[PDB]
Amino acid sequence: KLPPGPTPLPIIGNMLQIDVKDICKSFTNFSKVYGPVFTVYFGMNPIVVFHGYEAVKEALIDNGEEFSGRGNSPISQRITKGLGIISSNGKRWKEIRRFSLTTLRNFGMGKRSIEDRVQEEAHCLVEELRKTKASPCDPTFILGCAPCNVICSVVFQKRFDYKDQNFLTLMKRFNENFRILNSPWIQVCNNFPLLIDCFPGTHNKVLKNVALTRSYIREKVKEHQASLDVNNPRDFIDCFLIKMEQEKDNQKSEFNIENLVGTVADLFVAGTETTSTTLRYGLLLLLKHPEVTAKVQEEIDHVIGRHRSPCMQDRSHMPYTDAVVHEIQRYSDLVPTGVPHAVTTDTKFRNYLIPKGTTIMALLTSVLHDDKEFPNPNIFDPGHFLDKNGNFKKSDYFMPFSAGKRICAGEGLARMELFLFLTTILQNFNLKSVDDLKNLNTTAVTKGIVSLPPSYQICFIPV
Ligand code: HEM
Ligand SMILES: CCCCCCCCCCCCCCCC(=O)O
């Protein structure tokens, strides 16, 4: 039996009781009428929503294996064709994921640590910021390049020069699909597959954007094979190629070319625009909160100095900086509804039964914005992650990366990118606004699955 919920009108479902824009405000309202777990209908498709720490925890952690599905829609299945990590399921998923996770360990790619790659990029990021000569600017693009190049460095064993035309079309391609797939219209075309017919241009752009990206990665994969020194791998590409080698027999093992390309594109789709939006939302909060930025700057000076680049080891000695990054991700609420999951078999959830393959929506926003764990959860305040002695206070409610079996495969890489970029940036500049701070609003715009920070101009003042 499915959990209770609003009464569905026949073919459209609950689609009229939901605010397609702030779709998370609607769910929150239902929880007030139907409790922790409830069910809504997107057309003829059922979606069971889990709202609250208890529910979210129970579902993703405790009954994890059953909820370690993943959500797939008409569109995404068409794009990825079931390959990779994000979209794949079952034996394909576990097989790929595990390899990816080990390869994505700081020293899981060879002699050159992932950290070293980020650091190089942190320096490069800083240099481009110098070139703005302290003039006002929109950090969207520049900040965007850093993360995307990180994945590039991690996937192709060499960063791109911010001006390489190959780096730019590739990056603007991922930024396009992201932008499109983050449109509320995809949330209506997935539940009504006929509407795809009304967007031939958009539809065409996405398919052409996917074709050229895959097609590019293929060539890129081949030029790594013809220079493959199996003794010591260079990057994620070599590592996967070596794995494919010992599958000479297997011929079902998911370690083939078709999965390689797909898994790579997944590192780009999941690890680029996400970090980008957070560094973006991060600077904006640091800009709006000078006192906070000072203290971070005060810790950087003490623990790191004004000469060496910041590294991950400094984090354990910079409690306040840790809490700023944490509070950045929390406030940020990047993915409010989390990514859609699905149950592996018919599952029982406290008095209810969810048939194998039902769409699962764990509400991350509800955990992160918990009234008691973080008093006054709507205001930015690093104190949510600090104890009365200024020490870092870890939270079980810290779920910006989701929880359970399907937790972000790049959690390490993401937190690394956020800490290193932001600290290095603050180490070299001060943040001046193109107006008063009181004229600066940090309220997000959630016109989609990924909430975005508002457009803003910032001045990087080195001192
Ligand atoms: C601030 C940065 C990031 C945030 C907030 C974030 C968040 C998330 C979230 C919420 C999910 C879905 C988890 C679920 O199933 O419920 C996810 C999945 C994933 N992320 Fe990230 N992510 C970030 C960065 C990255 C980076 C840099 C990479 C690159 C390696 C990455 C790779 C992935 C992958 C591969 C998945 C799919 C995992 C699976 O289905 O098994 N993420 N991320
Ligand atoms: C100042 C004028 C701005 C123009 C505003 C235009 C608003 C209508 C836009 C309609 C866009 C149609 C999108 C079609 C996409 C597709 O074919 O896939």
Curated annotation (Swiss-Prot):
One Gene Ontology cellular component: endoplasmic reticulum membrane
Any GO molecular function: monooxygenase activity
GO biological process terms held by the UniProt record: epoxygenase P450 pathway; estrogen metabolic process; icosanoid biosynthetic process; lipid hydroxylation; long-chain fatty acid biosynthetic process; omega-hydroxylase P450 pathway; organic acid metabolic process; oxidative demethylation
UniProt-listed Enzyme Commission number(s): 1.14.14.1
Result of altering residue 356 to N: In allele CYP2C8*10; reduces enzymatic activity with paclitaxel as substrate; reduces enzymatic activity with amodiaquine as substrate; decreases intrinsic clearance of amodiaquine
Required cofactor(s): heme
Keyword ATP-binding applies: no
Stored Gene3D superfamilies: Cytochrome P450
Catalysis: reaction(s): an organic molecule + reduced [NADPH--hemoprotein reductase] + O2 = an alcohol + oxidized [NADPH--hemoprotein reductase] + H2O + H(+); (5Z,8Z,11Z,14Z)-eicosatetraenoate + reduced [NADPH--hemoprotein reductase] + O2 = (11R,12S)-epoxy-(5Z,8Z,14Z)-eicosatrienoate + oxidized [NADPH--hemoprotein reductase] + H2O + H(+); (5Z,8Z,11Z,14Z)-eicosatetraenoate + reduced [NADPH--hemoprotein reductase] + O2 = (11S,12R)-epoxy-(5Z,8Z,14Z)-eicosatrienoate + oxidized [NADPH--hemoprotein reductase] + H2O + H(+); (5Z,8Z,11Z,14Z)-eicosatetraenoate + reduced [NADPH--hemoprotein reductase] + O2 = (14R,15S)-epoxy-(5Z,8Z,11Z)-eicosatrienoate + oxidized [NADPH--hemoprotein reductase] + H2O + H(+)
Annotated effect of mutating residue 220 to R: In allele CYP2C8*9; increases enzymatic activity with paclitaxel as substrate; reduces enzymatic activity with amodiaquine as substrate; decreases intrinsic clearance of amodiaquine
Locations listed in the record: Endoplasmic reticulum membrane; Microsome membrane
Official protein name in the record: Cytochrome P450 2C8
